[PDB]
Amino acid sequence: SVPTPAEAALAAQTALAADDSPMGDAARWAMGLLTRPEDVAARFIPTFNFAETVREWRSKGPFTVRAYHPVAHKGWVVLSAPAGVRYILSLTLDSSGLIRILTLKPETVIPDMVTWNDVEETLHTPGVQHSVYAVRLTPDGHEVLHASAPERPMPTGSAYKLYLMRALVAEIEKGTVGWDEILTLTPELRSLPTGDMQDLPDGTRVTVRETAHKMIALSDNTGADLVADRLGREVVERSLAAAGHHDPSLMRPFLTSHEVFELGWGDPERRAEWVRQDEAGRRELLEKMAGVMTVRGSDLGATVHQLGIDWHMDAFDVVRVLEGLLQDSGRDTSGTVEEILTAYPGLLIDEERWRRVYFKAGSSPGVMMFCWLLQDHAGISYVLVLRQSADEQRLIGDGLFLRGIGAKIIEAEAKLLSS
Ligand SMILES: [Cl-]
Numbered sequence: 001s002v003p004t005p006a007e008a009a010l011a012a013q014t015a016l017a018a019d020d021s022p023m024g025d026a027a028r029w030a031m032g033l034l035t036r037p038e039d040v041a042a043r044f045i046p047t048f049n050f051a052e053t054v055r056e057w058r059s060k061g062p063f064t065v066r067a068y069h070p071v072a073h074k075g076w077v078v079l080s081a082p083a084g085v086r087y088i089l090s091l092t093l094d095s096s097g098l099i100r101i102l103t104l105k106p107e108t109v110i111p112d113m114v115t116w117n118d119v120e121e122t123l124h125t126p127g128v129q130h131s132v133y134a135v136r137l138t139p140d141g142h143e144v145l146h147a148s149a150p151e152r153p154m155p156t157g158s159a160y161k162l163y164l165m166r167a168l169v170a171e172i173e174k175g176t177v178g179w180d181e182i183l184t185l186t187p188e189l190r191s192l193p194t195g196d197m198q199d200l201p202d203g204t205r206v207t208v209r210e211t212a213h214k215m216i217a218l219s220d221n222t223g224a225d226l227v228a229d230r231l232g233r234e235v236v237e238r239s240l241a242a243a244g245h246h247d248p249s250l251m252r253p254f255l256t257s258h259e260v261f262e263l264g265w266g267d268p269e270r271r272a273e274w275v276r277q278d279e280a281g282r283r284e285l286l287e288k289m290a291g292v293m294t295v296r297g298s299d300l301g302a303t304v305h306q307l308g309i310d311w312h313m314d315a316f317d318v319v320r321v322l323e324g325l326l327q328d329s330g331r332d333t334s335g336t337v338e339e340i341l342t343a344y345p346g347l348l349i350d351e352e353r354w355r356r357v358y359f360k361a362g363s364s365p366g367v368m369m370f371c372w373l374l375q376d377h378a379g380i381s382y383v384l385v386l387r388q389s390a391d392e393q394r395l396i397g398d399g400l401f402l403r404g405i406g407a408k409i410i411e412a413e414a415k416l417l418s419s
Pocket of ligand 1: 074346361
C-alpha cells in the first residue's frame with residue numbers, strides 16, 4: 001500500500017504547512033519567496049545580490065511541492081515546475097533557525113535500488129573515483145555485503161572528526177580531560193563553516209561535551225579545532241592506530257580544519273612548500289601558519305586533497321572507527337557519547353527498524369563521503385561507507401547524489417543489507 005504520486009505530493013504539501021519546527025519555518029518562508037532586504041536580513045545568519053537570485057529562481061516556476069525532507073538543521077524540498085522539470089530547494093540552518101545556505105538546483109535523480117549492481121551503475125561517473133563498502137558486524141567478524149575499492153585510501157573530509165571523537169573518549173577514560181571542562185573560543189581558534197561555533201564571540205566558554213556534540217552533529221569545524229587544540233596534535237596522532245586507522249602516516253601531520261582551509265586556499269607558495277616537505281618540515285610550516293585565518297569561504301574551489309591537504313583513510317578505517325565508537329558508547333554508562341553520536345542521523349530514519357544510527361559526512365573540493373552505522377532492535381549492526389573523489393568539484397556536486405544513494409540503500413535495507 002505504497003502512496004501513489006498524487007498522495008505523496010499532497011502528504012508533502014501538508015507536512016510542509018504543518019511542520020512546527022525551525023526547518024518548517026524556514027522552508028515555508030523560502031517557498032514564499034518562490035510563490036524586502038530587512039526581512040531577508042532577519043531570516044539569514046548575521047554575516048550573510050539575493051533579490052536578483054530570487055528573481056531568477058521565480059522565473060523558473062510556478063512550482064509545486066512534490067516531496068519534503070526535513071532532517072534537523074538540513075532540509076530538502078523537491079519541486080516540479082512547468083513541463084515536468086524538477087528542482088530541489090536545499091536549506092541549511094544555524095543553531096537558532098537562521099538560514100545559512102539556501103539553494104535551488106536541478107533535481108538529483110536516484111532510482112529505487114534492487115541490487116548492489118544498481119548502486120554501482122547509478123554512482124559511476126567518469127573522472128570520479130568511488131567506493132561503496134557495506135558490512136554486517138558480528139561477534140565472529142565482519143560479513144561483507146558489498147565492496148568496491150574499500151582498500152583504496154581516499155580523502156574523507158570531516159570523517160576525521162570520528163577519529164578526533166575516539167581520541168577524546170580515550171582521554172576522558174584516562175582522566176586527562178573531563179566532559180564538563182571549559183574550552184574557550186579565541187580569534188586564532190575560529191574556523192569556517194560547516195558549523196555554528198565560529199559565530200560565537202571571542203572568549204566564549206563552552207564545555208567539552210557541548211563542543212564535541214557540535215563537532216559531530218553539525219560537523220562543526222570550530223568545535224573540532226577546539227577539541228584538537230585541547231588534546232594536542234601529538235595525542236591525536238598517537239591515538240590513530242588503536243582508534244582503527246591502518247596507516248596513521250597517511251594522516252600525519254593530523255590537520256585541523258583551520259589548517260586545511262588556510263593552507264589549501266591561502267598563499268600558493270606556502271602550499272607548494274608543503275608539497276616539497278617531509279613530516280618534520282610540514283609540522284614546522286603549520287606552526288608558522290598559526291594565527292587568525294585569512295582565507296574565506298569564497299576562496300574555496302580548486303582541489304587540494306591530492307596534495308595531502310585532507311584526511312585520507314580506507315573504507316576499512318571508517319568501519320573500524322564506527323565500530324569502535326559503538327564500543328566506546330556502550331562503555332560510557334552516562335550516555336554522553338551516545339547522545340553526541342545519535343543527534344543527527346543525516347536522514348529520516350525508520351525508528352521502528354533501527355534502534356540507533358550513527359552518521360558522519362565529509363566534504364571538500366573534489367571530496368565527498370557519507371557513512372552510517374545502523375543497529376536494529378535485536379542488536380544487529382550494519383556499516384555503510386560511500387566515498388567519491390575527483391580532480392574537478394563539478395563531477396561530484398553538493399553531495400545530494402551520494403547522500404541520496406545512501407538513503408536509497410537504507411530504504412532497501414531488506415534487499416541490500418539484511419536479506
Ligand atoms: Cl549531511
